[PDB]
Design a protein around this ligand. Structure first.
Ligand SMILES: C[C@H](CC(=O)O)NCC(=O)O
Ligand SMILES: [Cl-]
Ligand SMILES: [Cl-]
Length: 296
């Protein structure tokens, strides 16, 4: 219908708030405007969302084609397409996986065909130590020194989940070498251009993350020294354990908020566990009408 209102942050400031959005009744033009906001303001916060797990998936389906997480221990017991980050037991049982994403990453960056849009529906929000950190890697690329842009021009990076693969209940008593090899078979390292062109905005995106990017190689596929990756992590703010770097944005939320963000441009990371406050979050990840980049 006609009372969804989008309030974009002024200028080049990241973020936008969306009032009066109803996924069941929003028009085609509403969805078109919401997606444009996601690609340009990078983070759209839908306000006043009171959804069941099934309704959350229905909302995600308005934006794109959902993909379920490839490791099923993360999946919601009713809705396979919902990724559950939770350290609150439900009737004594562990739902989803606790303490996820404690590292800089873009979602499915270790996979050959990553999705363009991530949706997060916080269920239990810490009172004090709430929020998620973000870095716009297109803005971060633009702010690099010109020579550093030159150095990565024409290079490729390898992305792998081999550092942050989480042990599963059925992995107990297995030799660790056998899990390490299984991960390399199941999810081999993915080669991508170090930078790619955003299909929706045309921006140049620096598609690296401290958590998943394990190597960089030249225009001929010969590995380059990892010091280059360290200098790129350092320049974009990914090594600042104080989180005060100018590139870093802390996105807070309140009950009823639903975060929808550009999974091409942004990397993100959970806060330090400086308090014992718990986190429960539902995630839906959808493919939109373009691949992550033209080379996929
Ligand atoms: C390794 C992470 C999950 C986690 O932090 O356990 N993957 C999230 C994703 O890439 O979609
Ligand atoms: Cl590798
Ligand atoms: Cl923190």
């Amino acid at each position: 219908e006609g009372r969804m209102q989008i309030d974009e942050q002024p200028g080049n400031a990241i973020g936008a708030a969306v009032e009066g959005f109803d996924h069941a009744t929003a028009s085609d033009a509403d969805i078109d405007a919401l997606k444009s906001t996601i690609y340009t303001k990078k983070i759209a916060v839908l306000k006043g969302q009171d959804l069941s797990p099934q309704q959350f998936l229905a909302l995600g389906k308005r934006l794109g084609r959902p993909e379920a997480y490839y490791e099923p221990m993360y999946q919601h017991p009713e809705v396979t397409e919902i990724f559950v980050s939770s350290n609150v037991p439900e009737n004594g049982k562990q739902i989803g996986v606790p303490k996820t994403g404690k590292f800089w990453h873009a979602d499915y960056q270790f996979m050959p065909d990553p999705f363009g849009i991530t949706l997060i529906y916080p269920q239990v929000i810490p009172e004090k130590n709430r929020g998620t950190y973000f870095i716009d890697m297109g803005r971060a690329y633009d702010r690099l020194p010109e020579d550093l842009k030159k150095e990565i021009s024409g290079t490729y990076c390898r992305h792998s989940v081999r550092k942050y693969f989480k042990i599963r209940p059925h992995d107990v008593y297995r030799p660790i070498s056998e899990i390490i090899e299984e991960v390399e078979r199941k999810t081999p390292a993915v080669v991508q251009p170090t930078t790619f062109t955003h299909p929706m905005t045309g921006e140049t995106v620096l598609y690296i993350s401290e958590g998943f990017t394990v190597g960089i190689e030249d225009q001929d596929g010969k590995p380059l020294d990892e010091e280059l990756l360290k200098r790129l992590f350092d320049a974009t703010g990914q090594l600042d354990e104080s989180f005060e770097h100018d590139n870093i944005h802390l996105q807070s939320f309140e009950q009823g908020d639903l975060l929808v963000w550009d999974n091409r441009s942004l990397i993100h990371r959970a806060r330090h566990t400086t308090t014992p406050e718990p986190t429960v979050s539902y995630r839906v990840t959808v493919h939109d009408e373009r691949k992550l980049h033209d080379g996929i």
